[PDB]
Design a binder for these strands. Sequence first.
RNA 1: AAUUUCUACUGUUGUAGAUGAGGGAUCUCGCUCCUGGAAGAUGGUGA
RNA 2: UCACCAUCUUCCAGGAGCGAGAUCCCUCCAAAA
Length: 960
Amino acid sequence: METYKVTKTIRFKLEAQNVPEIQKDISGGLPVAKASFNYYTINKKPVDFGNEKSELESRLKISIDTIFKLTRENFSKKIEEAITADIQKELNNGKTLLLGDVPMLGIENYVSLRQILKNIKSNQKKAFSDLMQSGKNYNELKATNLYLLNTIEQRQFDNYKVKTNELEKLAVKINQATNDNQKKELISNKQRVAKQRGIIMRDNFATWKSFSNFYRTISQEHGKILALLKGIEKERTESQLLKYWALILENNGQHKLILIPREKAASCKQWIASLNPSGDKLTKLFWFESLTYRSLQKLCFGFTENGNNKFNKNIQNLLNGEFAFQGDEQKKIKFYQSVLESKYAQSVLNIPIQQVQADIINQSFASLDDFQIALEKICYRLFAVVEANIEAELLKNDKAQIFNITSSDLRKEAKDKIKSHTQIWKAFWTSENKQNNFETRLNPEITITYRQPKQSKIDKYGERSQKNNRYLHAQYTLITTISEHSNSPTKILSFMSDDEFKSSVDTFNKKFKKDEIKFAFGIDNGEVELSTLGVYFPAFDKTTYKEKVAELEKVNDYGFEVLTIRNLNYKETDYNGKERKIIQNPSYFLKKENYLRTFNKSETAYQKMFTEQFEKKKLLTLDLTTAKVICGHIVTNGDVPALFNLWLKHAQRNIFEMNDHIQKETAKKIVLKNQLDTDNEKLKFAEYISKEKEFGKLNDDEKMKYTKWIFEDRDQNNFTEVENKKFKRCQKIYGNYSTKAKAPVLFASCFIDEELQSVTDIFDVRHIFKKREDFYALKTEEEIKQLIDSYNTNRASHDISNEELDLKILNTKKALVANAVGVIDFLYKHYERRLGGEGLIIKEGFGTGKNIYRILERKLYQKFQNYGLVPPIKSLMAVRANGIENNKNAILQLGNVGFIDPAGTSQECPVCIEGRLEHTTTCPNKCGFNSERIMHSNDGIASFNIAKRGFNNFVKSKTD
RNA sequence: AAUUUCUACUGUUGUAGAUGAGGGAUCUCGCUCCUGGAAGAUGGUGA
RNA sequence: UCACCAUCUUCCAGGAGCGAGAUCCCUCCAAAA
């Protein structure tokens, strides 16, 4: 399908060769210099600007008389007069009524409208509050000046006073007897009490409420204008760093940067243009020139109204501003064509006269866009010169400054696995690009950043350590931005209104035909670990159980190949006398080349190794948790350690905040256990894992049954379907704790000063830690327990702040999701190629309404956006809406992406549906299904079910 | 504890993923200090 | 029994200073001696 004007920021390492001027000025990257490839774009000198402040001031000097006309709210004349009377008080001394800003805006004589409004608001509430506390009556109220409130009904305040009274009563209960449990309880109640009171006040008070709205109104304009000012001022850098003309020099397969002083710029070009156009004399020079549709606009119009722009002065006859071109694309296009056609234009706009003439001037266009694209399409020009001795002449005369561009990839051309970003940069220079009319486009703007090496790793840690690493040094980082598929419509769905968006996206969705679909994936929502994955094909929809099972027996025909690690413990010794462990990075044992260079072994040994250490399988599901791609291979257990780190930190954070829960001076004994015995603990736990709203509807016996339904076998605790359904609805976080099944979990209960079997605080250690077999290879459970035990009491162990903890976690999350995105991308390609069609990525519709999952959602989307299978959009998380509730048939579609309802889960059998089932266990209905040689675990059945339903919903979905 | 990515693991030239860049307004909720009022426990005030 | 003082504490309201989070919009190529 089509492609998009995707924009990608990119960056490279800079090395100083000669910086006579830059070095004069020489935590994170710091801007130091900004430069452009376009000799015209430099000419926007800062001085080329007026005193914009004064004009904006015209928008701000509101008078008292207009204020009531600035609001949608309706006020009784008496209320309006009172506001005016109040304002008259405030009208004293200062006269310049303003929005409110830096005194530079309006001089100290200024008074903020917002503040005055906020003032009055505060005074009224305060006055009212103390009246309340004093215990006066309605008549008292009426005799007061509370214009905002004295209009309040006799009825209403009754409530409020009563309620107020309630707070007083409650307060003495808190003044006295100082019992925590009840005091907390009491505080809760009061909080509630206050909640509704606010509701009451907020909602039931028209004058108050109205005014509230009024204040909430005035602030919006102030906010809109303030954004403008900030933008303007920030952009309006009086001494803006943009002072250099950017050039490109190539030499010996390496590219160099050149920055020229502005003053010298002019003359430079002159000298430049006199040289030969082509050759193979080693040294080469480059520069950019182009004209843009967007610039035409700003050339043809703009300052025109100001009487400044001299271009339009000379073409007045050709014309009536841009706005005059109302509902007529043929007018603008022909207008423009004339402009171009205009020799005068041709005398100063550096354009391909011949080319423009042949295609632009000569031809007509169906729509404005078409014209636009062509313009910039052609306008983009790349110039080259061949001559030796160039750089010294530039240095000798032009006082130029030069930089070197470098990376890991650059410094070895002679290899295959180049990083994805470097392709772009490389591909840019190629002739084929030029042949295609500069498909890939370099924006004419660049950035230079400085980054002081971080102290923390310098002195005693890498410097004195004599390490190989180069973070401790000074660095110059180049920031650039590139385009893809520029020669394509700049389709934007962002700016649409309500009804508009839905139509547009639907039109988009029409691209995909129901018969084209060949396969559909599915992503489970399970929180036991990251997630689980499945795939489906329509052919599985047979008519009878026997047909379905037989079809399901063709995994050799439909499945995907996989490699599995045999022995994790496996390790070797290299040619340098150090142990390598396979588990830590399998690649060293996969890619033949690396193996040889490391271990000095022969081809046959490699072959024997390969065969012995691994296994091959074909499956219809997968464990996404640990999955990674290596050298075009899928491995379940590729990266154990990534998970491990995740959990560990997981543990660290939750435990640390538990102790740091202002647990001051109280012996909140935090005890770590592998299970829970008493009902008090169990009941105190199930609450954490259920919705309080639905929890309150359970009785004590139901609460007891719920705990048994959690911590006890459900095959013997004969709960009813309604009980199960109620429990499922109560369930908040999906999980498993069946007795001590193959995923044992810990617990971090917190006794209160002793083993008092009545009250406790228990975070589900599902937030803290879980145990898996695989980890053992890394560390022994005893070592694992000892380590974590450090957390609970060892305060000194917490030498690092949260600011680090959080970002470590956040980035750890990023890494997993990145591995995930790799596997999913790989798979998609495979099937596509294998079946010659497009598939559907169906995801459990977890959203804002209902953390990784959000992340997973996002990054997934972007990997697919470069493919153009999905619309362009503001931001996925600012899109989603209703239509995702109470329907097993519901579906939301965005391109090939789709969201559905979470009703129903693993239990539904693939074949007989109704029979509850577990992986490795035969169907209770004896339908004939088996999961022995088709899936990997229990979770696989779920991800199979979700796709099955998702595809059925998609076909059911009808635009008809 | 080799990095445009120091972002992941291993590790002085590997496997993956990386648009992102900058920036700002509004609104809520947590924690400290200040001013006034409410309201409460003592000891002196007159039976 | 009542006006004020002594003492310490709870609460609300209002103001300032500090911290976290949702939600939205913009930025990323143009001139004459």
